[PDB]
C-alpha cells in the first residue's frame, strides 16, 4: 500500500448534530485517508448494515479511489426503499440509487435525538414530482406542482400543492414512523490511482 | 417406512419453562420417534418460521435422520442475525450458522415470560472474543478479556472486560429490545438409515 497516514473523517459525518432532509441529502467526498470501517462495523449500534457488491468483512482489505458519504433521515418503515432497483415514494422522488450500486447502507434509529413531543417539522421530503429522479440526483426546486388540467402558477389552489411535506416525528410513534438516520457510502472501483485505502501495512 | 410410533418430544422442548442463554445455547438430539411438523407450522404464535433447504409444507413427507434442536433466547431486533451467511455480534461471538444449512429457524416473541419488572439479568451473551466462532460451536469458557496490551491476569481493571454481558429485558423495554425465543431445527441426509420422520 502507498505510504499514507491519516484517519478518514467518518466521525464527523456519523456524529454530526445536523442531518439534512431527504430532498436535500448531504453529500461529502472522502479521499486521501486511511479508513477503518471495522470501527463502525463493530459499533453494534446500527439497526441495519447492508453492503451491496462488497463483503463487509473484506472491506478492510479493499483499496478504493473515491468515497462518497450521503446522509439523510427517513421514516422507519421506508428504510427498505433505500436499495438498488427499489421503487416507492422515496426511492424515485427523493433519492434514487443506480442499478449497479457498489456501496453500503447504514441505517440506525434516532428516535430520541430527532423526534420531540408535539411532532418535529424540521424534516421535509418531496411528495409530488413530474418524473422519477435519475440515480444520484438531487432536486431542491420548490415549484408548485399542478395535479390537474388547471394550469395554476404560484397559487396553492384546489389542484396545486406544495411539493414538499413534513414528516412530523414524535416520540409516541411505533416502529415504522420513528426517525431513522441513514448514511450511504458509495465506493468506486475506478481504474485510477487509489487514494482511500484500508489499513494493512 | 419405520414401524415406530412413539411421538417425538416437541412439546417439552418448545414449551420448556426456561430457555438457556445464547452463549450456552441448549442443544438436544431427537431420534427414534415420529414427528409432526404440521402442527408447528399451523400455529400462528411463531412470528418467524423461516426454512432453508426444505419447504415447511414438505416436511411431513421427507424422512430425516438424527435431527437436532438448538434453543435459546436473544434480543428481538437482532433476530435476523440467526441465519446462514449473516454476520454480527451474536452471529459471530455467540452462535454461527453454517452456510450449507438445511433446516428451519422458528423465532417468536416471549416478552410475557422472559421480561420482568426488575429486569431479567439471567440471560447473558458473549461480547468480546479473539476470533469469530466456527459453525455450530459453543464457547462457554469465560475468564477475562485482554484489550490493553498488558497481561491482565484476573482483574477486571482498565482494558479488562468480562466477556459476558447481561441483557436488560423489561416489559416496557421497547419492542426491538424485547426478548425473543429462538429454536433452530437442523436436519441431515446421510448414507445411513433413517430414524425419525412424519407418519404414513
Amino acid at each position: 500500500f502507498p505510504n499514507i497516514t491519516n484517519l478518514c473523517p467518518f466521525g464527523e459525518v456519523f456524529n454530526a448534530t445536523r442531518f439534512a432532509s431527504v430532498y436535500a441529502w448531504n453529500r461529502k467526498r472522502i479521499s486521501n485517508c486511511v479508513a477503518d470501517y471495522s470501527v463502525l462495523y463493530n459499533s453494534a449500534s446500527f439497526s441495519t448494515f447492508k453492503c451491496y457488491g462488497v463483503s463487509p468483512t473484506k472491506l478492510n482489505d479493499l483499496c478504493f479511489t473515491n468515497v462518497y458519504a450521503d446522509s439523510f433521515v427517513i421514516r422507519g418503515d421506508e428504510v427498505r426503499q433505500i436499495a438498488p432497483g427499489q421503487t416507492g415514494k422515496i426511492a424515485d422522488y427523493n433519492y434514487k440509487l443506480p442499478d449497479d450500486f457498489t456501496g453500503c447502507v447504514i441505517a440506525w434509529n434516532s428516535n430520541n435525538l430527532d423526534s420531540k413531543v408535539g411532532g418535529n417539522y424540521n424534516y421535509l421530503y418531496r411528495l409530488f414530482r413530474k418524473s422519477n429522479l435519475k440515480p444520484f440526483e438531487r432536486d431542491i426546486s420548490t415549484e408548485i406542482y399542478q395535479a390537474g388540467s388547471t394550469p395554476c402558477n404560484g397559487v396553492e389552489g384546489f389542484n396545486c400543492y406544495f411539493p414538499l411535506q413534513s414528516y412530523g416525528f414524535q416520540p409516541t410513534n411505533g416502529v415504522g414512523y420513528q426517525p431513522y438516520r441513514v448514511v450511504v457510502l458509495s465506493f468506486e472501483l475506478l481504474h485510477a490511482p487509489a487514494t482511500v485505502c484500508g489499513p494493512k501495512k | 417406512f419405520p414401524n415406530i410410533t412413539n411421538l417425538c418430544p416437541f412439546g417439552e422442548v418448545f414449551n420448556a419453562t426456561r430457555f438457556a442463554s445464547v452463549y450456552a445455547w441448549n442443544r438436544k438430539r431427537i431420534s427414534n420417534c415420529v414427528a409432526d411438523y404440521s402442527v408447528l407450522y399451523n400455529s400462528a404464535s411463531f412470528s418467524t418460521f423461516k426454512c432453508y433447504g426444505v419447504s415447511p409444507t414438505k416436511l411431513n413427507d421427507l424422512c430425516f435422520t438424527n435431527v437436532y434442536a438448538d434453543s435459546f433466547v436473544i434480543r428481538g431486533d437482532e433476530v435476523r442475525q440467526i441465519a446462514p451467511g449473516q454476520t454480527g455480534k451474536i452471529a459471530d461471538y455467540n452462535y454461527k450458522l453454517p452456510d450449507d444449512f438445511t433446516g428451519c429457524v422458528i423465532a417468536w416473541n416471549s416478552n410475557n415470560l422472559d421480561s420482568k419488572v426488575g429486569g431479567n439479568y439471567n440471560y447473558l451473551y458473549r461480547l468480546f472474543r479473539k476470533s469469530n466462532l466456527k459453525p455450530f460451536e459453543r464457547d462457554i469458557s469465560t475468564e477475562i478479556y485482554q484489550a490493553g496490551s498488558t497481561p491482565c491476569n484476573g482483574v477486571e481493571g482498565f482494558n479488562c472486560y468480562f466477556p459476558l454481558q447481561s441483557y436488560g429485558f423489561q416489559p416496557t423495554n421497547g419492542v426491538g429490545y424485547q426478548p425473543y425465543r429462538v429454536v433452530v431445527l437442523s436436519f441431515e441426509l446421510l448414507h445411513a438409515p433413517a430414524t425419525v420422520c412424519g407418519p404414513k
Epitope: 413531543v117 416520540p171 409516541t172 | 421480561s115 420482568k116 419488572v117 426488575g118 429486569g119 416496557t172
Partner: antibody, heavy 119, light 110 residues
Framework: QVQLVESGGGVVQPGRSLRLSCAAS????????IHWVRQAPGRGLEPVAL????????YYADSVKGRFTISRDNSKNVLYLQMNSLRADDTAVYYC??????????????WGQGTLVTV | SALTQPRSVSGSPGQSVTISCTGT?????????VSWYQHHPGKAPKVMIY???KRPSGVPDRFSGSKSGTTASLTISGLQAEDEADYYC??????????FGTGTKVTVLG
Amino acid sequence: QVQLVESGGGVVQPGRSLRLSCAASGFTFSDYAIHWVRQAPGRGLEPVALISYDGNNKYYADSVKGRFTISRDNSKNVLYLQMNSLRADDTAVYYCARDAEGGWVAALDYWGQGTLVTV
Amino acid sequence: SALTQPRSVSGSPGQSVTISCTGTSSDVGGYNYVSWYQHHPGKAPKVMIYEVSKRPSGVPDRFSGSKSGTTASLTISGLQAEDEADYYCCSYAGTYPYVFGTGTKVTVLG
C-alpha cells in the same frame, strides 16, 4: 384463582413502627412483581413501594423513600412492608397489588382488599 | 408528580362522557403505556384500560381510550348506575414507581 390478602394494622402513635404482611395464592408467587399503593382519605391513589420478583430491586416514592422497607419471602409465599417513624400524613388505606409484568404491560391486574392504618 | 385530572364530570344516562389526563415529556406524552382503572367505593380497583387503548377481558366495549400529544382521554358511552365510581389515570415514567392521576368521579343524573 389468584387471591391476595393483607393482615394490615390498626392505630399507631406517631414516630413508631408498623409491620404489614401480604400473602398471595393461586399463582407462582416468585414470578410477578408487587406494588404497595396508598390512598389517603379524600385524596387520590399514589404508589408507595415496589418490589421485584426476587426482591433484589426495591423502589420507593420520593415522599416515602428512606423510611419504608419492603421484603419478600418466596419460600413461605409472603411479603412484608416495614414502616418507621410514622407521621400523621401516613394515615391511609394500603393495597398490596400484583403487577401484570409481561401481560397487560404497565398495569396492576389483581388487587387485595386493602387495610386501613390510622395514626 | 401526579398527572392532572378533572375533579368531576357529569352526564345523563346514555350520553357519552370523557375524562382527560395531562402529563409531560416523561409521562403519557412519552412512552405509550397509559392505563385507566376504576375504584368503586369499598371495593378492590380493577383495570379497565391498559396500554392506552387495549382493554382487558370481560370489560364492556363501551369504554374506549386514546392518547394525543401529552394528554390521554378515556371516553365512556352509554353510562349506567354501575359507573358511579372514580376513575384513575396511571402512566409509566422512566422510573418504575408509577405516577397516578387524580380522583375523577363520574356522576349520572337520576
